[PDB]
């Protein structure tokens, strides 16, 4: 997070960030409501290369810089007891959502052409739904009916239709399908909790209600936002959760120093090591492991020192793994340590209650405490019924 | 190089004065005693006729032009040196209704 030190010099800093975005392609620069500028880069050394370029060559001003932080994502664990319908009441929608099978996602993150027996990446939508359905039913033990039912997908997730009026009126919906996918992309690009991307969440469309007389341009606009709220509402009852990136760490050490390495891992809290590979011919070991993105702030130098210069590390994302943060995303009673690292029992309530404060979605005098609440969309009256049965925590 | 510069002399001289100038220079830089004189002869040719001398001198001035530029720069420099509340408030009211849920008026 950047801020220019002397505020009157902001118009210079902007003009440098337009350069950097060009020169370093991988960088992604965002500007927020707070006006906080978010730099997004591959890792430690890369941020260093920027910030040196940004202080030295391009914008000669000096700038204040935050602690290294990470990017989260938002997902659903569980199902949607509720299957509620939300209408912006000529249109009443009910959208279920469930987790995706780990294998499926694992084959999405890697775009794949389905060569031989490999599971095809869903990107072939233009292909025969019979071929694609053959792929799904073949590989996954995937549903037979749903295989045909599928409409469309996006990077993190897929959309599916299960409902009677599809059997009653497939055409009238086929009109507005292209409308629903817009609501879908809109839905995924943001999120219910942190307004951060939804990932690994399978959306099954349970119902849609359409008004009498239909409409011309009312059906055009009115569908998108209502569909969006249908996707948020679909998620929040599924057991939602806050995703944190995990770096695949690759380490190279002399043999006898292996124990030291292990210690560091046990300290980080994110991470553990999958493999220890003898390197033929040399006195080396490749230790492959994993660590969360948010936990990796200082890792490399910790290692490189601790072994007295023997050894090495690299942190990288390819797999774009993610993992649940051990807390429960919506809870009022989480312990906020206030200047200490929070106890693992609740880290998710922390991360979300922070990102929310950063992204100005939630307003408090100082520490706002507004949860992402299902209640706001349903209307109380449904909400009151829901709370009675313990559906809402 | 100016005709005055060529002769190494200082800058409304009369036809008589023009003759006298040449005479003075001739005594000083007499070619038979000591290329430059080519300039002297030409300028004298027009200077010896008061009309040509006057017209030629008619056409430091440029440098005056420099003064004009300086003046223009000075003029530019010195002279140059020498609802919102209502809107946000209305928006605040509008949100309050949405919160209270009271139906919006047709704004």
């Amino acid at each position: 997070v950047l801020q220019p030190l002397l505020p009157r010099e902001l118009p210079k800093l902007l003009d440098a960030l337009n350069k950097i975005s060009k020169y370093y392609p991988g960088v992604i620069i965002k500007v927020e409501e707070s006006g906080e500028h978010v730099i997004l880069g591959n890792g430690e050394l890369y941020m260093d290369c920027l910030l040196y370029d940004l202080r030295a060559s391009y914008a000669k001003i000096e700038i204040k810089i935050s602690d290294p932080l990470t990017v989260f994502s938002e997902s659903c664990s569980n199902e949607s007891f509720a299957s509620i319908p939300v209408s912006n009441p000529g249109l009443s929608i009910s959208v279920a959502a469930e987790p995706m099978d780990s294998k499926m996602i694992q084959d999405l993150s890697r775009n794949t052409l389905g060569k031989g027996q490999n599971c095809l990446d869903i990107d072939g939508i233009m292909d025969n739904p019979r071929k694609l359905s053959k792929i799904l039913r073949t590989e996954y033990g995937w549903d037979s009916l749903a295989s045909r039912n599928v409409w469309s997908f996006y990077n993190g997730n897929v959309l599916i239709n299960d409902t009677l009026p599809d059997e009653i009126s497939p055409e009238l919906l086929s009109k507005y399908k292209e409308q629903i996918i817009q609501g879908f992309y809109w839905a995924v690009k943001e999120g219910p909790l942190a307004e951060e991307p939804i990932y690994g969440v399978q959306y099954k469309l349970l119902s849609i209600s359409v008004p009498s007389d239909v409409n011309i341009d009312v059906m055009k606009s009115q569908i998108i936002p209502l569909m969006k709220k249908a996707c948020y509402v679909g998620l929040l009852t599924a057991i939602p959760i806050l995703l944190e990136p995990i770096y695949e760490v690759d380490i190279t050490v002399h043999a006898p120093l292996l124990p030291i390495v292990e210690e560091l891992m046990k300290k980080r809290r994110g991470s553990r090591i999958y493999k220890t590979i003898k390197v033929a011919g040399t006195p080396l070991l490749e230790v492959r492991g994993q660590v969360p993105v948010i936990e990796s702030a200082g890792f490399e130098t910790d290692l490189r020192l601790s072994t007295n210069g023997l050894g090495m590390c690299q942190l990288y994302f390819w797999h774009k793994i993610w993992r649940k943060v051990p807390g429960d995303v919506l809870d009022k009673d989480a312990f906020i340590p206030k200047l200490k690292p929070a106890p693992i029992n609740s880290l998710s309530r922390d991360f979300v209650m922070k990102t929310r404060r950063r992204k100005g979605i939630s307003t408090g005098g100082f520490m706002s405490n507004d949860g992402p609440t299902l209640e706001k969309y349903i209307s109380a009256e449904l909400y009151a019924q829901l709370r009675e049965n313990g559906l809402v925590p | 190089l100016n005709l005055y510069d060529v002769l190494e002399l200082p800058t409304y001289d009369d036809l008589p004065q023009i003759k006298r100038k040449y005479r003075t220079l001739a005594l000083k830089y007499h070619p038979d005693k000591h290329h430059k004189f080519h300039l002297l002869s030409t300028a004298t040719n027009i200077l010896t006729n008061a009309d040509v001398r006057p017209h030629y001198d008619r056409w430091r001035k440029t440098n005056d032009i420099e003064r004009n530029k300086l003046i223009q720069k000075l003029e530019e420099s010195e002279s140059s040196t020498i609802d919102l509340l209502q809107i946000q408030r209305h928006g605040e009211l509008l949100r309050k209704l949405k919160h209270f849920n009271l139906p919006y008026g047709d704004w």
Binding site: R8, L10, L14, D217, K376 | I87, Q88, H90, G91, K98
Partner: protein
């Protein structure tokens, strides 16, 4: 006012729904903002279309800002928007 749960943007969205105009985030582009202070805020902006017309709005505090023709944003009344 801090007490009030609802957030503006919501209001804007609601207004847009009646109009039938659609508001989209637009990720990269941003506009420098002039607010009372002798300083300019920077805010992301979104574009709303009635059919195939795109105009861009940035909201800071509790206001909607729409750019003047030559350039630079001007605050406007919410009722005052017709595209």
């Amino acid at each position: 006012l801090g007490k009030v749960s609802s957030s503006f943007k919501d209001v804007v969205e609601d207004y847009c729904l009646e109009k039938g105009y659609l508001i989209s985030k637009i990720p990269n582009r941003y506009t420098q903002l002039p607010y009372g202070r002798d300083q300019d805020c920077i805010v992301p902006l979104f574009e709303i279309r009635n059919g195939k017309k795109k105009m861009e709005v940035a909201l800071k505090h509790d206001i909607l800002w729409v750019e003047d023709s030559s350039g630079t944003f001007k605050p406007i009344y919410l009722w005052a928007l017709d595209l």
